[PDB]
Amino acid sequence: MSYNYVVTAQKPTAVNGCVTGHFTSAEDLNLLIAKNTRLEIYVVTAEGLRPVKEVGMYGKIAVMELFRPKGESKDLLFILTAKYNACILEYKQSGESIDIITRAHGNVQDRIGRPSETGIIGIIDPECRMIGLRLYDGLFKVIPLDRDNKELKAFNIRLEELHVIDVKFLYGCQAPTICFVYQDPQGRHVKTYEVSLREKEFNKGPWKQENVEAEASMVIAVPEPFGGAIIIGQESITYHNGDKYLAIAPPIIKQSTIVCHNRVDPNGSRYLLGDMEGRLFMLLLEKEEVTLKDLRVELLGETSIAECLTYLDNGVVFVGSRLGDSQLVKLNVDSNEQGSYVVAMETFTNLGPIVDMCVVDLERQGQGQLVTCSGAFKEGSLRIIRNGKLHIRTVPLYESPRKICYQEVSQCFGVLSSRIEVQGTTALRPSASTQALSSSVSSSKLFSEEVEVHNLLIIDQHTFEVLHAHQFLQNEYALSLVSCKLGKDPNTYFIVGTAMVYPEEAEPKQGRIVVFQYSDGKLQTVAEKEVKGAVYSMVEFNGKLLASINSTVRLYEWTTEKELRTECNHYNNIMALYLKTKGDFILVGDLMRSVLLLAYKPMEGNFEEIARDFNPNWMSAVEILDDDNFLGAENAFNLFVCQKDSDEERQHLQEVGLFHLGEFVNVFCHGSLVMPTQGSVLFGTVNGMIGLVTSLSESWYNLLLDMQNRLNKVIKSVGKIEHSFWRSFHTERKTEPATGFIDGDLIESFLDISRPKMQEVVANLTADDLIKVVEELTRIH
Amino acid sequence: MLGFLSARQTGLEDPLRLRRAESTRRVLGLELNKDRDVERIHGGGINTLDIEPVEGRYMLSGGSDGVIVLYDLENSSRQSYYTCKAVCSIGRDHPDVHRYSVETVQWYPHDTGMFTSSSFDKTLKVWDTNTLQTADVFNFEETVYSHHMSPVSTKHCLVAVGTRGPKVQLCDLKSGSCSHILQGHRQEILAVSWSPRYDYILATASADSRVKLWDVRRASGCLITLDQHNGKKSQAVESANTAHNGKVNGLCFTSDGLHLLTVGTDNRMRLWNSSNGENTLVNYGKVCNNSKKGLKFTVSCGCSSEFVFVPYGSTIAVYTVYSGEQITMLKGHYKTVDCCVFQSNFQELYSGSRDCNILAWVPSL
Amino acid sequence: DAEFDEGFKVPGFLFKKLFKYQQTGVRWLWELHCQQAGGILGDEMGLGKTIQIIAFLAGLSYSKIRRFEGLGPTVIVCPTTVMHQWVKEFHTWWPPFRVAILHETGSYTHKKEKLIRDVAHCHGILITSYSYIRLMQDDISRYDWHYVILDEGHKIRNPNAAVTLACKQFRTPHRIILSGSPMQNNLRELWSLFDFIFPGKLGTLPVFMEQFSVPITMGGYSNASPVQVKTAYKCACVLRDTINPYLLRR
Numbered sequence A: 001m002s003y004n005y006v007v008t009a010q011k012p013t014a015v016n017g018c019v020t021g022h023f024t025s026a027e028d029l030n031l032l033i034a035k036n037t038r039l040e041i042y043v044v045t046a047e048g049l050r051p052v053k054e055v056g057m058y059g060k061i062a063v064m065e066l067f068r069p070k071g072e073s074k075d076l077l078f079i080l081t082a083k084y085n086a087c088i089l090e091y092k093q094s095g096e097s098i099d100i101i102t103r104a105h106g107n108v109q110d111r112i113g114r115p116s117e118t119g120i121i122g123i124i125d126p127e128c129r130m131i132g133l134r135l136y137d138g139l140f141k142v143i144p145l146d147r148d149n150k151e152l153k154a155f156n157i158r159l160e161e162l163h164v165i166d167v168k169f170l171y172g173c174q175a176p177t178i179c180f181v182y183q184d185p186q187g188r189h190v191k192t193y194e195v196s197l198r199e200k201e202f203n204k205g206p207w208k209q210e211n212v213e214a215e216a217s218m219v220i221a222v223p224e225p226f227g228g229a230i231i232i233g234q235e236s237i238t239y240h241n242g243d244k245y246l247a248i249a250p251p252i253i254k255q256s257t258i259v260c261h262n263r264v265d266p267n268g269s270r271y272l273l274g275d276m277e278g279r280l281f282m283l284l285l286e287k288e289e290v291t292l293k294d295l296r297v298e299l300l301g302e303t304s305i306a307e308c309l310t311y312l313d314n315g316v317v318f319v320g321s322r323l324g325d326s327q328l329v330k331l332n333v334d335s336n337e338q339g340s341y342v343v344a345m346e347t348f349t350n351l352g353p354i355v356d357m358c359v360v361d362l363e364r365q366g367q368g369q370l371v372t373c374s375g376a377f378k379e380g381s382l383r384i385i386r387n388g389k390l391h392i393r394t395v396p397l398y399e400s401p402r403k404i405c406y407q408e409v410s411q412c413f414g415v416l417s418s419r420i421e422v423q424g425t426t427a428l429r430p431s432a433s434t435q436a437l438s439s440s441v442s443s444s445k446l447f448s449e450e451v452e453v454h455n456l457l458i459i460d461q462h463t464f465e466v467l468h469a470h471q472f473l474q475n476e477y478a479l480s481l482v483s484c485k486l487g488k489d490p491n492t493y494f495i496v497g498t499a500m501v502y503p504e505e506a507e508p509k510q511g512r513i514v515v516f517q518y519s520d521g522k523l524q525t526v527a528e529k530e531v532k533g534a535v536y537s538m539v540e541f542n543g544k545l546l547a548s549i550n551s552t553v554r555l556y557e558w559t560t561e562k563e564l565r566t567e568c569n570h571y572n573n574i575m576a577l578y579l580k581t582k583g584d585f586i587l588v589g590d591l592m593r594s595v596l597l598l599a600y601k602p603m604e605g606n607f608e609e610i611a612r613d614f615n616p617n618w619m620s621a622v623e624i625l626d627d628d629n630f631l632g633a634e635n636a637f638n639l640f641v642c643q644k645d646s647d648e649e650r651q652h653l654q655e656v657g658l659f660h661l662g663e664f665v666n667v668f669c670h671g672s673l674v675m676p677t678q679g680s681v682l683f684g685t686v687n688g689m690i691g692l693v694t695s696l697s698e699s700w701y702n703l704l705l706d707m708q709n710r711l712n713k714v715i716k717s718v719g720k721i722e723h724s725f726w727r728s729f730h731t732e733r734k735t736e737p738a739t740g741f742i743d744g745d746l747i748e749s750f751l752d753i754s755r756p757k758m759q760e761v762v763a764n765l766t767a768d769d770l771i772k773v774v775e776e777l778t779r780i781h
Numbered sequence B: 001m002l003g004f005l006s007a008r009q010t011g012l013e014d015p016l017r018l019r020r021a022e023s024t025r026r027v028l029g030l031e032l033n034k035d036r037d038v039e040r041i042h043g044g045g046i047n048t049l050d051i052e053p054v055e056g057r058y059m060l061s062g063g064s065d066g067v068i069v070l071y072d073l074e075n076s077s078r079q080s081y082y083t084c085k086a087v088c089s090i091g092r093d094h095p096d097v098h099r100y101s102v103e104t105v106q107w108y109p110h111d112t113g114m115f116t117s118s119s120f121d122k123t124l125k126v127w128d129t130n131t132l133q134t135a136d137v138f139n140f141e142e143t144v145y146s147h148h149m150s151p152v153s154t155k156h157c158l159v160a161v162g163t164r165g166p167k168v169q170l171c172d173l174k175s176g177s178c179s180h181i182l183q184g185h186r187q188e189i190l191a192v193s194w195s196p197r198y199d200y201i202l203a204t205a206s207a208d209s210r211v212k213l214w215d216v217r218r219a220s221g222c223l224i225t226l227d228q229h230n231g232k233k234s235q236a237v238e239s240a241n242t243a244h245n246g247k248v249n250g251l252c253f254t255s256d257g258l259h260l261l262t263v264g265t266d267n268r269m270r271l272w273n274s275s276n277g278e279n280t281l282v283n284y285g286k287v288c289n290n291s292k293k294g295l296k297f298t299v300s301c302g303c304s305s306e307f308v309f310v311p312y313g314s315t316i317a318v319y320t321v322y323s324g325e326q327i328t329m330l331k332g333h334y335k336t337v338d339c340c341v342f343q344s345n346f347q348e349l350y351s352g353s354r355d356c357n358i359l360a361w362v363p364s365l
Numbered sequence C: 001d002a003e004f005d006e007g008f009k010v011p012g013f014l015f016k017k018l019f020k021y022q023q024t025g026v027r028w029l030w031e032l033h034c035q036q037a038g039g040i041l042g043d044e045m046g047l048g049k050t051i052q053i054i055a056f057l058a059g060l061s062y063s064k065i066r067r068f069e070g071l072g073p074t075v076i077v078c079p080t081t082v083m084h085q086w087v088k089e090f091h092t093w094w095p096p097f098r099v100a101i102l103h104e105t106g107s108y109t110h111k112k113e114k115l116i117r118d119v120a121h122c123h124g125i126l127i128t129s130y131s132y133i134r135l136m137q138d139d140i141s142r143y144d145w146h147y148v149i150l151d152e153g154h155k156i157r158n159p160n161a162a163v164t165l166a167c168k169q170f171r172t173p174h175r176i177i178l179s180g181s182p183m184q185n186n187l188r189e190l191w192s193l194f195d196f197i198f199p200g201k202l203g204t205l206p207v208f209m210e211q212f213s214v215p216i217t218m219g220g221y222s223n224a225s226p227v228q229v230k231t232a233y234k235c236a237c238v239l240r241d242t243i244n245p246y247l248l249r250r
């Protein structure tokens, strides 16, 4: 059995959902922000946001909506978790003490069901008669509220349409009436149903199905004066109230898709609309005496790429971004002489999608210092993280970074970047590749809307300025990037593995391994090698280059001529996506066969499949903890540790560790941000969490597991979710309790409880001993 | 594929997107793998295959010669080429060997240690996998065409058995009770399938062209009788309300259990709403079957679009469940295909046939 | 009030009057309702089966559960001597029910078919006798009754008596038998009772006889060899398991 300790070094920063309402008091205007597992409650002050509470859910908050049942003084909060823990929470302040009481909870996971493509939708009737959840294809779950539950008993209504894009409750309807866009082979249509809680089934909606734009993806329920709905598609915005059909095609919204919206007014005369480019639009409803006259869209300006946006008051808009820093902007009445009304008031740091990261002992201290490729298209950046809490520098790249490696001898970072050009081509904005000191483009003899251009950025490790930007070939995607010295020559090379991406194909057939040398402020191309696939990953492996072309893992040697020459191949992979190394052993994370322990037996000069995990886990990242412990991250937000067991059953890796992280790990890396536990592996996630896995001994693992159970018996979670259920390994075809993993968050929460609760924890084990233990545990991050 | 990897790594798309789109791509690229083989042990045609639901490692196979084979589908060898070796076999020398054709074999859901198999020797035998000895035998007065255990029943352990008799036998493996019978059909029940969604919902298809949905708890007959037209041709129900214009010899619930696929000897496959048995009017074209026994066909699971793999003569026709568009026809067998079973972990298909072969279809690349 | 699994409440006063086993029985009746099965209240004579039935029906009307809203038109078939005993117990325990008697004694004084019609169309409890069920099956079965409680239902024990065939003509799933002795001479009688409450469980009388009656009987004759005794024990265990969910016998 493995003994691993997982803890949060940096809590998730990506805002996956934000709502406004009167949650903490009838007079307070609250901003509730869901970062993946954290619910952050602020009060909308006349200036900025005043934090009041930050709670940790035992769940990824998939749905988060405020609703006020009749007679209630202040808004209750409905939260649905990714594992389908539903809860209704109320905020109760008793002087200094703050609580989040669970007015109701349950688990609404159907045992079986195809979870819907567009993802978990949760809507609440505008009169709070029911919570409609679209979780699975062809079903629509209803949680009644008039029947005041404490267990949230919910029932399915069979929905005759199986591909539902979006759904909302309409306003000004005597019955709960849903309006949804669905896709059938004949196109996309908007349909309405009336929900009968008494008959527990749908009825004919107020206005029959209507054939809408092909890419209709948004439904906006419009409040009572107008009623109806506003369906946003790519090229049109259309308004339906049953007989009225307003339709506009503002040319300004054709360039990008509208992905979030928010009702500025109570009467829905104005909406904010956020697109994937970061533009912010204002959709205006002109009333007639009331009916609706016409629709207008005006471009307010630009923000961070909004996942969610909420209008607070007095022109203040919170732009909650998953890809970039969240924003608090102001909407000016007059333009800024640049055509923009948006003016950023405040910025909330978001380590965005952490797609890669490295630990460099920069400044030649004894302290590690993370450098992460954070963010995406316009919000891409390098974040430098260090303890001092964690201080986060930001280097705006203005283009999506993809990989990063540190070349110490040259005092630089090599960063794979990607920028989107439209037309031959034109950059939509000045990206860090385009403002390098020097530049170059790949002139290769091997291969002879909007496109992605890829560059290799050499960035100064003192000033974090782009010393150089080498553009790669047309239609060439740089995927992997390693900095290393090969063979016996002394030069340290930037080695980039690329692929040729054409729309005519689903998997690249062409690619190359380019060897660069950074010297004298220039990036010379020292070598090239045409390979017959995408080079997803390269690790330097005992003086040799170990690349993973589409399904083959092959080992290249650096010859005295300075070219790459193959030494051995390995083919038993669906897609070798992740490569790691420790000594003679290679860990291969696959697209869906999940891990493979390979050995380069040097005496022969070929690979040997030592062990394999035969479970179908879709990896997102992999790491080697010990000689025989292999950390892995499945795309279902789970961590598992495999172990070479102890005949042909010795070729079976044993999954001795299981743990549901709730985060999508993109990268592991050995290192620590600090000056009892063995090893230290950081990982960065899509939500912006930085976590830390380390090995425990058996004795302390037993002790900490015991205290974990005690804290579960004592600490009460917000939605009355069980910690063991939350950390249970979860996949659509498998579900097991956690094991071999200790939630260091729950352990470290042993300090934030009063002394009587501590004795409740420490019945049969003195307390001060465990205070010392948990302090020593917190020492690691 | 690189767009999908970048969208997954950067959080634009839920990882479910990449899983499902890639599983679909793998299903469309399904092709006869000569890079994988299944060891030939059956002297007769393979009628039935069943991959275990938990871990999907092992496969059962029932032959026309009365043997049962238990295969390992994991590539335990370090080569990229491997033969799915036969771990066990209830052979001609096994004292409990079936005396005639094994028409169905099924793993016990929830556990690999027991599996059940029914034969034309008028027996449903329960086998303990580890000792490979029979634990129980349910003798019937009439030969068994198809049995099925509920894939979902954490509560009951009934086996629905369809024989040439007009009644559906329910056998309780917990204290052995083979008395319960569902009466209301008029000819041989050629296919039985428990709902994967509802613990006590059973779909039964018979040679009298009728498919009935039952609630085995209920004391008042079949819930629903599937009707081709849904009321256009309506008659006081004594002979009307046929699902097909021939024998209905195949049943398969879709993955989510909200729809039912029936195949009949009218050379048609129909898609029905499993809640109210209403025909969805999905076309599916013409599905050549003339099988005189139960026709075992499967659906896909966990793809962007669901598929149905139906035996089409000597080929396996792949159709989209919810649009009818025939994806393709996998042709690698030499005689009529009797059964196909889907390995949901890797989008692999195994199909048996009367030519005493079991062919693996794996995605290309 | 006492509340059960889904929506079934029985009034607090009516419930408080009951004993622990009687309320266990009211529960059991209502799981039978939920599964849409019939069953045999087999509690032996004197324990009070009229009260469990009346309490359950009263909680069925009082809970307003969902075709019929609450309680539909139910028929109680009983020996002739207890029709008025049933009426008395209904009037003391749940007075809101309209409880008619379908008999010569009766209280109607018009065409009996009219009484059956009216009770079918106002959701009353029609208390009749086995003789009347035999004689008026033409009228008793045209009305879709909600429950078919048979009191001393072992009058259905002969699968070939005309009363038996008549009582097995009710289309409803909610069949109940009250009999503290639901087996009197042999297992064929048990088969007949279970063929009324749930036709399929025990098979056709062919299968039931061959599988259970011949084995279970042949192991009780004095001269029975040990092997045949053990077969009888095994078959008895199987039969008890099979009929456990639908017999409640305290």
Ligand SMILES: Nc1ncnc2c1ncn2[C@@H]1O[C@H](COP(=O)(O)OP(=O)(O)O)[C@@H](O)[C@H]1O
Pocket (backbone or CB within 6 Å): C017, C018, C019, C022, C043, C044, C045, C046, C047, C048, C049, C050, C051, C180
């Ligand atoms: N819980 C109770 N409280 C008061 N009287 C009861 C109760 N249960 C039964 N009785 C009385 O016991 C008597 C016998 O019950 P009865 O229903 O006739 O027995 P059986 O179960 O044989 O039909 C009835 O007259 C009834 O009034």
Ligand code: BEF
Pocket (backbone or CB within 6 Å): C044, C045, C046, C047, C049, C152, C178, C179, C180
């Ligand atoms: F005592 Be009797 F069975 F009503």
